[PDB]
């Protein structure tokens, strides 16, 4: 049962060369990675942005299921077909999510879209690995991940230009394109449409055909790649050396599931058990840390801005004003001290304003568009408000007598920060790609992990506004190398019989770790700036420790 097939396949690929076909397939699969990045951003940063100006993580729970299912099915029915199904499900349910009226059905549709998009990546990497020669499985496969960053910047810029506002968890209606939230989904999902359109021009991986048994089809695909590569140059038209290398569906479904479970079991045995356990450790730690910190950074930015505004607030003791009719808008925080006999306030727009220990007699409010303003220890007496935004929600406990309410009325920076963050990892790729074949996958992984560990402490030094963005950029640019190195290692180690299954399972573990990291890190945002600085450091320490215990690239 010696695997001479792998050696012969590599021989054919090396004879063929790296022609135009590799770059064409690179673009086609990069569009799918772009779709993955857009969905990740829209599920981690835009979806929770829907507030009342976090049940948005169930999409991750669907992502993990999709990753496992598509990874298992790909090695049975093919890589191209599973990628097509994944993108199709994601795109169709994104279109359906752009029309629904209500948050619950929206979450359901985005969950079912995350299923497919999470399936995407494992298939993409296992698919492109089989076409590259063993010489450059690091340089090109690393270049392939720039499309995740391009998709991130695409989503961030589109949100920053189309939906610079937020608060639509309770703002919707039967109309269309009337909130600008229903135009973000379509222009985020266009990349998936392009990916599906382009994936029909590429042939299936020859390795899957050779393993399944249809050697002629793999030979045909290799012939196609050779023909295109040689014709690209024009003059050299080198020839190819020809060589050999009803109760009817329930049983079939059970059979396919049993084969997938056999593939999963094979990942854990006298061989591949140690490798897979080490892989799980590294992937969990890395994804945990990265997602947690990428979510904590904009939140800390917001909290620092809030603290600055709180410290930028002043008040002076109020006096008794006869028909003050202060018809100008106020941005001061408090107005402690108030008598205000015969008040005649009209058409004043308070933001961040408070009245404490104030008194109002025969006061009259005409129209106030109050927001974030509340009344504490206010002794209203014979007060009529007519049209106001005052309710029990905006009104703290206080003494009110003979008060009447005749009538009543009914993002821009998180996206910029994330855009800079995702645009700052491009140098990390433009260094990882040109050094991973020269330096080494394992050692580059170790160095990148330890560098991320050291930058973890730096995360806290920059309590200023600018230093936080600087440190986010640094962290991303440092950890991208680890991600690329581990991708190359994972694709190289597992053979074609279990590559996609193993990668999909580790992707599911990474998504579960993303959920746990988001939850834990947002649980203690602004708690001495140490919990996200100690937990991340420990996790990356485990990652670096494990990274030095993996088998070489030959494994």
């Amino acid at each position, epitope marked *: 049962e010696r695997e001479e097939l792998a050696q012969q396949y590599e021989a054919i690929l090396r004879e063929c060369g790296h022609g135009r076909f590799q770059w064409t397939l690179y673009f086609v699969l990069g569009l799918a990675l772009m779709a993955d990045g857009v969905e990740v951003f829209v599920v981690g940063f835009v979806l929770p942005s829907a507030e009342k100006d976090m049940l948005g993580l169930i999409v991750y729970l669907g992502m993990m299921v999709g990753a496992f299912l598509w990874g298992g099915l790909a090695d049975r029915l093919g890589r191209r077909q599973c990628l097509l199904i994944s993108l199709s499900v994601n795109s169709v349910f994104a279109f359906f999510s752009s029309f629904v009226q209500g948050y619950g059905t929206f979450l359901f549709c985005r969950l079912l879209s995350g299923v497919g998009i999470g399936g995407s990546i494992p298939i993409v990497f296992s698919y492109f690995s089989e076409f590259l020669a063993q010489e450059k499985r690091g340089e090109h496969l690393s270049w392939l991940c720039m499309f995740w960053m391009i998709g991130g910047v695409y989503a961030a810029a589109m949100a920053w230009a189309i939906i610079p506002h937020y608060g639509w968890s309770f703002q919707m209606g039967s109309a269309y394109q009337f909130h600008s939230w229903r135009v973000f989904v379509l222009v985020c999902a266009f990349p998936s449409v392009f990916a599906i359109g382009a994936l029909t021009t590429q042939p299936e991986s020859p390795r899957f055909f050779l393993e399944n048994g249809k050697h002629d089809e793999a030979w045909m695909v290799l012939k196609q790649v050779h023909d295109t590569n040689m014709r690209a140059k024009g003059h050299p038209e080198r020839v190819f050396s020809v060589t050999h290398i009803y109760q009817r569906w329930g049983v079939r479904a059970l059979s396919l599931g049993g084969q997938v479970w056999g593939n999963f079991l094979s990942c854990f045995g006298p061989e591949y058990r140690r490798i897979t356990l080490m892989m799980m450790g590294v992937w969990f730690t890395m994804s945990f840390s990265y997602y947690g910190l990428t979510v904590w950074f904009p939140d800390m930015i917001r909290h620092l801005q809030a603290v600055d505004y709180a410290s930028r607030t002043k008040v002076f003791p109020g006096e008794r004003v006869e028909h003050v009719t202060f018809n100008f808008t106020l941005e001061n925080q408090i107005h402690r001290g108030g008598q205000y006999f015969n008040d005649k306030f009209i058409g004043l727009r308070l933001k961040s304003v408070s009245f404490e220990d104030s008194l109002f007699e*025969e006061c009259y409010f*005409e129209d106030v568009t109050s927001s974030n303003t509340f009344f504490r220890n206010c002794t209203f007496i014979n007060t*009529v408000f007519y049209n106001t935004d005052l309710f029990e929600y905006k009104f703290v406990n206080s003494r009110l007598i003979n008060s009447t309410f*005749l009538h009543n009325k009914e993002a821009y920076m998180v996206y910029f920060v994330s855009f800079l963050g995702t645009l700052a990892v491009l140098p990390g790729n433009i260094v990882s790609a040109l050094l991973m074949d020269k330096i080494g996958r394992l050692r580059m992984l170790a160095g990148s992990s330890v560098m991320s560990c050291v930058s973890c402490f730096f995360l806290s030094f920059g309590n200023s506004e600018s230093a936080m963005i600087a440190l986010l950029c640094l962290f991303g640019g440092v950890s991208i190398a680890s991600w690329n190195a581990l991708d190359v290692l994972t694709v190289e180690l597992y053979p074609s019989d279990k590559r996609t299954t193993a990668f999909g399972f580790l992707n599911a573990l990474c998504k579960l770790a993303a959920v746990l990291g988001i939850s834990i890190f947002t649980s203690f945002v602004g708690i001495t700036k140490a919990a996200p600085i100690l937990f991340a450091s420990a996790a990356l320490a485990l990652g670096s420790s494990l990274a030095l215990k993996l088998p070489e690239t030959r494994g």
Partner: nanobody
Amino acid sequence: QVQLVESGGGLVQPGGSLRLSCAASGSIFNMRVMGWYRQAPGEQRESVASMASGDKTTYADSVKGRFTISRDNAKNTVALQMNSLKPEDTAVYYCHAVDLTRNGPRVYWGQGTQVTVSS
């Protein structure tokens, strides 16, 4: 005490209209002239609309393209132009006045009039 006047109840078909006119007399000092409310069987009064002061108005979103308010201060009256009277949306309609005099704010309410829909 300002005496308020209520009117305009009875059956109107959807597609038809009614003019419910608020009026008042006595002790009126540049008042916010009576706006409208809908009283249901349940103890509660839903806002409808008001053109009570200046030339500006606030209409409830629930009465968009259904209840229109026009005011004539020179008369101390407010006219509610009822239209789009979908059959289920019946109510007792009330005039709500606000006194803007020297002794401070005071309010007045009428007994209301019942509007039902013909079909």
